[PDB]
Design an enzyme around this catalytic site. Structure first.
Site, short mmCIF file in Angstrom:
data_model
loop_
_atom_site.label_atom_id
_atom_site.label_comp_id
_atom_site.label_asym_id
_atom_site.label_seq_id
_atom_site.Cartn_x
_atom_site.Cartn_y
_atom_site.Cartn_z
N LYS A 1 16.16 0.27 -1.07
CA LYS A 1 15.04 0.73 -0.24
C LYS A 1 15.32 2.11 0.35
O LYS A 1 14.47 3.00 0.32
CB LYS A 1 14.76 -0.28 0.87
CG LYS A 1 14.51 -1.70 0.43
CD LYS A 1 13.16 -1.84 -0.24
CE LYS A 1 12.74 -3.29 -0.41
NZ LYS A 1 12.45 -3.96 0.88
N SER B 1 7.47 -8.93 0.35
CA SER B 1 7.88 -7.65 -0.22
C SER B 1 8.20 -6.65 0.88
O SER B 1 9.29 -6.07 0.91
CB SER B 1 6.78 -7.11 -1.12
OG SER B 1 7.14 -5.85 -1.64
#
Ligand SMILES: Nc1ncnc2c1ncn2[C@@H]1O[C@H](COP(=O)(O)OP(=O)(O)OP(O)(O)=S)[C@@H](O)[C@H]1O
Lengths: 197, 144, 72, 72
Positions: A144, A101
């Site tokens: 992100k 992750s």
């Protein structure tokens, strides 16, 4: 309306030994996740919480491997693997995206847990880690960076081979966020830690 | 447990007590996979299965006496039980959706503070119940 | 097309001082399986990662027994 | 055992006994949820089935000889 839906910005983002602010990719729009690590002396056993896939267990193992490769550079314990159990908390179950992750973020998390120094904030970091100190590139840095801009965090380091990503994104996100390029996990041992060791 | 029944009489909720002393397996605390006849959830889940409301006052027993001879601790599991914001993220193996034990009021039992698992020494309050004298025992005898 | 998605004709690959590239076959077709062995100090036990079968560990000791005849 | 039988004779209610030692699971103390032909309760329900009254003198045989590992 009443209560804010989220915790307010940079009051949740506090410099702690335990906490860790890492970028996440979520298919309904990515988020950032609060990883919490606790390292007081034990035996070496790793423990997991939160409906986790085992890949995060092995990524924490690889983080332990890198901390075993370069111990004395930052005041890490000389032989902690026989005396430090590691226990991490993850708020969510599993990423549907493959790989770790945020692998180097967890590496920094348990390195700060081992050195007992609070993490720097205003820097949200993520990446995927290998066994020779090589932070291999991550796809989907788009969401992100979107989450980090939504987090108000403008400093976002990236793996070295995602530098060509910095030309294929449109500019309007790239200007709003500061980006550093790293190759070594020992490099981000200096980029999230409040002291230099 | 008289303290626990006192608290549960104050709140007028349901009260229950479960053992945790002598537990060696995390999969005793957690569930098990669906790989055998009559697969089972954890102790905690079935304990909630006998209660009928999602905010009772629940007591543990001898939380200073777990063990685990493999990697990992059930300390991290009852640490998941500790924070109510972490209560909706249980590890689970028979079930999979993390249950809402946020409203289940938590009260605990450990005879020795020193043998409570060290990842759980955070967010414990040491309220030491000492021994009893001659007259204090006599008075509580003669009274109740 | 944008940025070249895949690494070009390999004259300089990733820095490989503890590892090497590797050839294999999948059902969908082969990939370059650069095995990552990390030599960390420990107790000389064999510590597998990578969701591995046992065939890995006897091949592993085949290599280990090869270089245990070939230390110096 | 005949002590218990005597105590039940003095009680003038019928003695019973069930050799519960050596049982490895809850699946024949509570039974199991019905799903096929051959579905069966616990041994205690068998015991009080072959006792035709609702207030017998039940004698447990080997509680200390119970076994545990699987099936609850
Ligand atoms: N100072 C006291 N300490 C313990 N029990 C007391 C005290 N004063 C009164 N009691 C009575 O004793 C009973 C509860 O104590 P015990 O039965 O001896 O212990 P317990 O609560 O059954 O088991 P524990 O302590 O949870 S392992 C109740 O009937 C209380 O009213």
């Amino acid at each position: 309306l009443g209560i804010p839906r989220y915790r307010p910005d940079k009051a949740e983002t506090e410099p702690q030994v335990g906490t860790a602010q890492g970028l996440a990719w979520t298919p309904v729009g990515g988020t950032l996740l609060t990883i919490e690590v606790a390292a007081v002396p034990g035996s070496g056993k790793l423990s997991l919480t939160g409906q986790l896939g085992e890949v995060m267990k092995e990524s924490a193992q690889a983080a332990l491997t890198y901390l075993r490769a370069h111990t004395q550079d930052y005041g890490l314990p000389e032989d902690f693997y026989n005396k430090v159990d590691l226990h991490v908390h993850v708020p969510d179950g599993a990423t549907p995206k493959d790989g770790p992750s945020a692998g180097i973020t967890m590496a920094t998390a348990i390195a700060s847990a081992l050195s007992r120094r609070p993490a720097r904030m205003d820097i949200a970091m993520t990446g995927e880690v290998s066994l020779r100190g090589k932070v291999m590139p991550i796809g989907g840095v788009k969401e992100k960076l979107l989450a980090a801009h939504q987090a108000g965090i403008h400093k976002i380091v990236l793996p070295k081979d995602n530098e060509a990503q910095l030309e294929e994104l449109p500019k309007e996100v790239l200007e709003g966020l500061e980006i550093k390029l790293v190759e070594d996990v020992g490099e981000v041992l200096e980029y999230l830690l409040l002291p230099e060791p | 447990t008289s303290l626990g029944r006192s608290i549960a009489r104050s709140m007028n909720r349901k009260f229950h007590r479960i053992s945790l002393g002598g537990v060696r397996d995390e999969a005793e605390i957690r569930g098990h996979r669906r790989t055998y006849i009559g697969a089972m959830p954890g102790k905690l889940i079935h304990a909630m299965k006998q209660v009928g409301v999602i905010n009772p006052v629940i007591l543990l027993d001898e939380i200073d006496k777990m063990s685990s001879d493999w990697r990992g601790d059930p300390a991290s599991a009852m640490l998941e039980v500790l924070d109510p914001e972490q209560n909706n993220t249980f590890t689970d193996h028979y079930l999979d959706v993390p249950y809402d034990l946020s409203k289940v009021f938590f009260i605990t039992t450990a005879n020795t503070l020193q043998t409570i698992p060290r990842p759980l020494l955070d967010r414990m309050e040491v309220i030491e119940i000492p021994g009893y004298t001659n007259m204090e025992k006599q008075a509580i005898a003669r009274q109740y």
